Design an enzyme around this catalytic site. Structure first.
Site, PDB file in Angstrom:
ATOM      1  N   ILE A  17      45.101 -45.331 -23.581  1.00  0.00           N
ATOM      2  CA  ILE A  17      46.538 -45.582 -23.756  1.00  0.00           C
ATOM      3  C   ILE A  17      46.949 -46.967 -23.235  1.00  0.00           C
ATOM      4  O   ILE A  17      48.078 -47.413 -23.472  1.00  0.00           O
ATOM      5  CB  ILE A  17      47.423 -44.446 -23.167  1.00  0.00           C
ATOM      6  CG1 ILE A  17      47.175 -44.252 -21.640  1.00  0.00           C
ATOM      7  CG2 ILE A  17      47.250 -43.140 -23.983  1.00  0.00           C
ATOM      8  CD1 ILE A  17      48.176 -43.281 -20.931  1.00  0.00           C
ATOM      9  N   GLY A  18      46.035 -47.619 -22.527  1.00  0.00           N
ATOM     10  CA  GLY A  18      46.271 -48.946 -21.989  1.00  0.00           C
ATOM     11  C   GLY A  18      45.053 -49.581 -21.366  1.00  0.00           C
ATOM     12  O   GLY A  18      43.950 -49.013 -21.374  1.00  0.00           O
ATOM     13  N   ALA A  19      45.262 -50.787 -20.835  1.00  0.00           N
ATOM     14  CA  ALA A  19      44.241 -51.558 -20.131  1.00  0.00           C
ATOM     15  C   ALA A  19      44.748 -51.866 -18.722  1.00  0.00           C
ATOM     16  O   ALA A  19      45.952 -51.899 -18.494  1.00  0.00           O
ATOM     17  CB  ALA A  19      43.929 -52.839 -20.887  1.00  0.00           C
ATOM     18  N   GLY A  20      43.813 -51.978 -17.787  1.00  0.00           N
ATOM     19  CA  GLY A  20      44.033 -52.312 -16.385  1.00  0.00           C
ATOM     20  C   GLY A  20      43.088 -53.430 -15.968  1.00  0.00           C
ATOM     21  O   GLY A  20      42.229 -53.844 -16.756  1.00  0.00           O
ATOM     22  N   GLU A  21      43.242 -53.940 -14.738  1.00  0.00           N
ATOM     23  CA  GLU A  21      42.417 -55.021 -14.183  1.00  0.00           C
ATOM     24  C   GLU A  21      40.929 -54.620 -14.052  1.00  0.00           C
ATOM     25  O   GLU A  21      40.030 -55.422 -14.330  1.00  0.00           O
ATOM     26  CB  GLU A  21      42.973 -55.435 -12.800  1.00  0.00           C
ATOM     27  CG  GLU A  21      42.327 -56.691 -12.230  1.00  0.00           C
ATOM     28  CD  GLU A  21      42.676 -57.075 -10.806  1.00  0.00           C
ATOM     29  OE1 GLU A  21      43.584 -56.445 -10.216  1.00  0.00           O
ATOM     30  OE2 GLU A  21      42.038 -58.018 -10.280  1.00  0.00           O
ATOM     31  N   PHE A  22      40.699 -53.366 -13.623  1.00  0.00           N
ATOM     32  CA  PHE A  22      39.389 -52.797 -13.303  1.00  0.00           C
ATOM     33  C   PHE A  22      38.771 -51.898 -14.391  1.00  0.00           C
ATOM     34  O   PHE A  22      37.624 -51.484 -14.259  1.00  0.00           O
ATOM     35  CB  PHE A  22      39.512 -52.029 -11.966  1.00  0.00           C
ATOM     36  CG  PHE A  22      39.999 -52.866 -10.806  1.00  0.00           C
ATOM     37  CD1 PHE A  22      39.141 -53.754 -10.156  1.00  0.00           C
ATOM     38  CD2 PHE A  22      41.317 -52.786 -10.376  1.00  0.00           C
ATOM     39  CE1 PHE A  22      39.597 -54.537  -9.094  1.00  0.00           C
ATOM     40  CE2 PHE A  22      41.769 -53.561  -9.306  1.00  0.00           C
ATOM     41  CZ  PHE A  22      40.908 -54.439  -8.681  1.00  0.00           C
ATOM     42  N   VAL A  25      43.076 -47.360 -19.094  1.00  0.00           N
ATOM     43  CA  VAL A  25      44.035 -46.315 -18.763  1.00  0.00           C
ATOM     44  C   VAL A  25      43.940 -45.333 -19.915  1.00  0.00           C
ATOM     45  O   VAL A  25      43.987 -45.738 -21.086  1.00  0.00           O
ATOM     46  CB  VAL A  25      45.482 -46.802 -18.510  1.00  0.00           C
ATOM     47  CG1 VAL A  25      46.381 -45.623 -18.095  1.00  0.00           C
ATOM     48  CG2 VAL A  25      45.504 -47.899 -17.439  1.00  0.00           C
ATOM     49  N   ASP A 136      55.176 -58.024  -7.448  1.00  0.00           N
ATOM     50  CA  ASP A 136      54.871 -58.053  -8.873  1.00  0.00           C
ATOM     51  C   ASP A 136      55.907 -57.239  -9.659  1.00  0.00           C
ATOM     52  O   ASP A 136      55.574 -56.601 -10.661  1.00  0.00           O
ATOM     53  CB  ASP A 136      53.447 -57.499  -9.074  1.00  0.00           C
ATOM     54  CG  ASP A 136      52.683 -58.029 -10.279  1.00  0.00           C
ATOM     55  OD1 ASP A 136      53.215 -58.922 -10.977  1.00  0.00           O
ATOM     56  OD2 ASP A 136      51.554 -57.528 -10.534  1.00  0.00           O
ATOM     57  N   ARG A 140      57.232 -55.239 -17.203  1.00  0.00           N
ATOM     58  CA  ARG A 140      55.864 -54.835 -17.607  1.00  0.00           C
ATOM     59  C   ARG A 140      55.169 -53.913 -16.574  1.00  0.00           C
ATOM     60  O   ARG A 140      54.198 -53.242 -16.921  1.00  0.00           O
ATOM     61  CB  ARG A 140      54.999 -56.077 -17.912  1.00  0.00           C
ATOM     62  CG  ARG A 140      54.690 -56.907 -16.667  1.00  0.00           C
ATOM     63  CD  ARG A 140      53.860 -58.136 -16.959  1.00  0.00           C
ATOM     64  NE  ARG A 140      54.318 -59.233 -16.108  1.00  0.00           N
ATOM     65  CZ  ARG A 140      53.890 -59.459 -14.869  1.00  0.00           C
ATOM     66  NH1 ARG A 140      52.948 -58.696 -14.335  1.00  0.00           N
ATOM     67  NH2 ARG A 140      54.402 -60.450 -14.158  1.00  0.00           N
ATOM     68  N   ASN A 141      55.663 -53.900 -15.312  1.00  0.00           N
ATOM     69  CA  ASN A 141      55.116 -53.087 -14.225  1.00  0.00           C
ATOM     70  C   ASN A 141      55.989 -51.856 -13.929  1.00  0.00           C
ATOM     71  O   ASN A 141      55.797 -51.170 -12.934  1.00  0.00           O
ATOM     72  CB  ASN A 141      54.851 -53.977 -12.987  1.00  0.00           C
ATOM     73  CG  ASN A 141      53.700 -54.920 -13.244  1.00  0.00           C
ATOM     74  OD1 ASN A 141      52.886 -54.705 -14.128  1.00  0.00           O
ATOM     75  ND2 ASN A 141      53.632 -56.018 -12.550  1.00  0.00           N
ATOM     76  N   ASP A 154      52.030 -50.288 -10.615  1.00  0.00           N
ATOM     77  CA  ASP A 154      51.160 -51.442 -10.339  1.00  0.00           C
ATOM     78  C   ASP A 154      51.311 -51.973  -8.899  1.00  0.00           C
ATOM     79  O   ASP A 154      51.907 -53.018  -8.660  1.00  0.00           O
ATOM     80  CB  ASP A 154      51.393 -52.553 -11.382  1.00  0.00           C
ATOM     81  CG  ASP A 154      50.156 -53.357 -11.775  1.00  0.00           C
ATOM     82  OD1 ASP A 154      49.590 -54.044 -10.899  1.00  0.00           O
ATOM     83  OD2 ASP A 154      49.798 -53.348 -12.973  1.00  0.00           O
TER      84      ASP A 154
HETATM   85  O1  LIG Z   1      51.656 -44.004 -22.750  1.00  0.00           O
HETATM   86  C1  LIG Z   1      51.562 -45.235 -22.814  1.00  0.00           C
HETATM   87  C2  LIG Z   1      51.883 -45.965 -24.106  1.00  0.00           C
HETATM   88 CL1  LIG Z   1      52.270 -47.685 -23.930  1.00  0.00          CL
HETATM   89  N1  LIG Z   1      51.183 -46.045 -21.791  1.00  0.00           N
HETATM   90  C3  LIG Z   1      50.925 -45.732 -20.423  1.00  0.00           C
HETATM   91  C4  LIG Z   1      50.192 -46.714 -19.750  1.00  0.00           C
HETATM   92  C5  LIG Z   1      49.913 -46.603 -18.421  1.00  0.00           C
HETATM   93  C6  LIG Z   1      50.347 -45.474 -17.680  1.00  0.00           C
HETATM   94  C7  LIG Z   1      50.126 -45.250 -16.270  1.00  0.00           C
HETATM   95  N2  LIG Z   1      49.399 -46.151 -15.555  1.00  0.00           N
HETATM   96  C8  LIG Z   1      49.095 -46.269 -14.180  1.00  0.00           C
HETATM   97  C9  LIG Z   1      49.713 -47.229 -13.378  1.00  0.00           C
HETATM   98  C10 LIG Z   1      49.345 -47.376 -12.043  1.00  0.00           C
HETATM   99  O2  LIG Z   1      49.996 -48.302 -11.282  1.00  0.00           O
HETATM  100  C11 LIG Z   1      48.378 -46.548 -11.484  1.00  0.00           C
HETATM  101  C12 LIG Z   1      47.723 -45.625 -12.276  1.00  0.00           C
HETATM  102  C13 LIG Z   1      48.083 -45.482 -13.611  1.00  0.00           C
HETATM  103 CL2  LIG Z   1      47.243 -44.316 -14.583  1.00  0.00          CL
HETATM  104  N3  LIG Z   1      50.605 -44.164 -15.651  1.00  0.00           N
HETATM  105  C14 LIG Z   1      51.325 -43.311 -16.398  1.00  0.00           C
HETATM  106  N4  LIG Z   1      51.594 -43.370 -17.705  1.00  0.00           N
HETATM  107  C15 LIG Z   1      51.098 -44.471 -18.352  1.00  0.00           C
HETATM  108  C16 LIG Z   1      51.411 -44.644 -19.722  1.00  0.00           C
END
Ligand SMILES: O=C(CCl)Nc1ccc2c(Nc3cc(O)ccc3Cl)ncnc2c1
Length: 273
Positions: A17-22, A25, A136, A140-141, A154
């Site tokens: 559902i997304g990308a992270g630094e490490f 997601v 931060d 976006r965060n 974040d």
């Molecule tokens: O459903 C979508 C469609 Cl853009 N996106 C997302 C993306 C990232 C998500 C997210 N990220 C996250 C952030 C942190 O700081 C720590 C751990 C996690 Cl898993 N947490 C919950 N829901 C999300 C939904």
């Protein structure tokens, strides 16, 4: 040791559902013993990580696990004693606030946008009163659920304070750029930028200006103008968050009170710049 440590068998990883630094997601399902299964989001750390990478990844879970507020993303669980290492949070259907707003341009009323900002300010009041600096704070965060409840996310750059002296330019206070001095007042500056992002349906702060152009403009006392149809009182709150003297900025408790009064006084949101 993490109080929210979960056995790996409790999590089922589904789509990215997304990308992270490490790492990525993912959307997933969490089944705690004797509890109904819930949808979750799962942050993973890519295989072959360094020990520093693991420590940095988990420092986010350590900060997060200290928080229990409606407008701070909830930690559901962590996987540290098994493989792969995971950070499991409540699922936020609408993802990052900036892209959610760009994809939903003009979908929401001023009161709906103000409600989103009030939630962010409440999350930040809690964070700052827990003696943390986020550093931060950007749309976006911020994560958004199906009912437009906005949550601070974040926590990688977050620090326990009252100043954090360092060793995200267009969201950063001028004194924090100049001296690497971060306080709750510099987070308030970032909050003012988030208000501008929200009232602009996710327009990029300072548009196409470079980071250097932003630093120079801010030094020359330039401030972002009010977004289209933005009530004067909301732009004034943005200007208050952007005062050169950090001591002159409102604290997050005041920001919440101001937004609470606007929500209750329709006349206060009925006059544009
Ligand atoms: O459903 C979508 C469609 Cl853009 N996106 C997302 C993306 C990232 C998500 C997210 N990220 C996250 C952030 C942190 O700081 C720590 C751990 C996690 Cl898993 N947490 C919950 N829901 C999300 C939904």
């Amino acid at each position: 040791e993490f109080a929210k440590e979960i056995d790996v068998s409790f999590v089922k990883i589904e789509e990215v559902i997304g990308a992270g630094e490490f790492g990525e997601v993912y959307k997933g399902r969490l089944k705690l013993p004797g509890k109904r299964e819930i949808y979750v989001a799962i942050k993973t750390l890519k295989a072959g990580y360094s020990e520093k990478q693991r420590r940095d990844f988990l420092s986010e879970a350590s900060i997060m696990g200290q928080f229990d507020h409606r407008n701070i993303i909830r930690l559901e669980g962590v996987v540290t004693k098994s493989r792969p290492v995971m950070i499991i949070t409540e699922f936020m259907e609408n993802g990052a606030l900036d892209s959610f707003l760009r994809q939903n341009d003009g979908q929401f009323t001023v009161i709906q946008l103000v409600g989103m900002l009030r939630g962010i300010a409440a999350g930040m009041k809690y964070l700052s009163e827990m003696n943390y600096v986020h550093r931060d704070l950007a749309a976006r965060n911020i994560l958004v659920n199906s009912n437009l409840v906005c949550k601070v996310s974040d926590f990688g750059l977050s620090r326990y304070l009252p100043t954090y002296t360092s060793s995200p330019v267009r969201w950063t206070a001028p004194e924090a750029i100049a001296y690497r001095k971060f306080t709750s007042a510099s987070d308030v500056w970032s909050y003012g930028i988030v208000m501008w992002e929200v009232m602009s349906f996710g327009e990029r702060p300072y548009w196409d200006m470079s980071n250097q152009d932003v630093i120079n403009a801010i030094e020359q006392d330039y401030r972002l103008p009010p977004p289209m149809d933005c009530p004067a009182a909301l732009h004034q709150l943005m200007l208050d968050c952007w005062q050169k003297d950090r001591n002159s900025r409102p604290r997050f408790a005041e920001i919440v009170n101001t937004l609470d009064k606007m929500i209750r006084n329709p006349a206060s949101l009925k006059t544009v710049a």
